[PDB]
């Protein structure tokens, strides 16, 4: 009986197996557009993606990973809010059954039909594993998803789901650029906070874009074909694998714009 998104396993119950589910600094959030306080200090990101070496790709049950080589800085964001490097290790999405759902953050109350996690680890802790046991471990750049003119740097994304339907298939992906999924503007929110999906670890600096990037119907379908289960188990869609907005308690967002 591990955890998932159902009835009787979803995010409701993760504090049972999880205790740091109710913590101090747990994601997503709501973000308050008019509380979020500007902060001039605050850095323009560094997306340096140039060199990108993406591997592979994973049905884990849950969403699926885009993996990348992270033996090297080819894929590293810094500045923003951040001191040091980070490099990237993997993205995958969140998203609902229905275009009104499926985003982990809010704006205002605001659900997007889908988020894009970029996920860095801090080189200053070696290895991924390492950097999740440190308050200053990771740093996830969130992006939005809502429907309507396709995005064409995702389209080969789309068209791989087909071969990783269910869980524990991977499939090979190499030279994925990821600036194709990046919105034109990088201003953004920055709060302190966690993983999404347990372990739930508080290892997390919180970078989400302003910017929402538009997606088709059709991409967006391609996503709930995917299934949670693996082959040969009845079929549950892989729909709703979002975690809805956590207590802010003592944490302020910060706005890199006015």
């Known amino acids: 009986h591990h955890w998932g998104y159902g009835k009787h396993n979803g995010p409701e119950h993760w504090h049972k197996d999880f205790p740091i589910a109710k913590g101090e600094r747990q994601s997503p959030v709501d973000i308050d557009t008019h509380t979020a306080k500007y902060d001039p200090s605050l850095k323009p990101l560094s997306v340096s993606y140039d060199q990108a070496t993406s591997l592979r ?34 993205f995958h999405f969140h998203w609902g059954s229905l275009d009104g759902q499926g985003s982990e953050h809010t704006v205002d109350k605001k659900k997007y039909a ?20 440190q ?17 064409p740097g995702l389209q080969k994304v789309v068209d791989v789901l087909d071969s990783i339907k269910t869980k524990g298939k991977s499939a090979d992906f190499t030279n994925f650029d990821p600036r194709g999924l990046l919105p034109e503007s990088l201003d953004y929110w920055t709060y302190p906070g966690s993983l999404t999906t347990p372990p739930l670890l508080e290892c997390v600096t919180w970078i989400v ?16 074909k995917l299934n949670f289960n693996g082959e040969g188990e009845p079929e549950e869609l892989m729909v709703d694998n979002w975690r809805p907005a956590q207590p802010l308690k003592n ?4 706005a890199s714009f006015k």
């Open 251 to 254: 944490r302020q967002i910060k």
């Open 135 to 151: 308050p200053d471990g990771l740093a996830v750049l969130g992006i939005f998803l809502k429907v309507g003119s396709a995005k």
């Open 114 to 133: 889908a988020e894009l996690h970029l996920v860095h680890w801090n080189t200053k802790y070696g290895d991924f594993g390492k950097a999740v046991q």
């Open 209 to 224: 874009l302003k910017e929402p990037i538009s997606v088709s119907s059709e991409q967006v379908l391609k996503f709930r």
């Open 57 to 90: 790709i994973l049905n884990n049950g849950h969403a699926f990973n885009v993996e990348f080589d992270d033996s090297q800085d080819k894929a590293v964001l810094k500045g923003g809010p951040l001191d040091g490097t980070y490099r990237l290790i993997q």
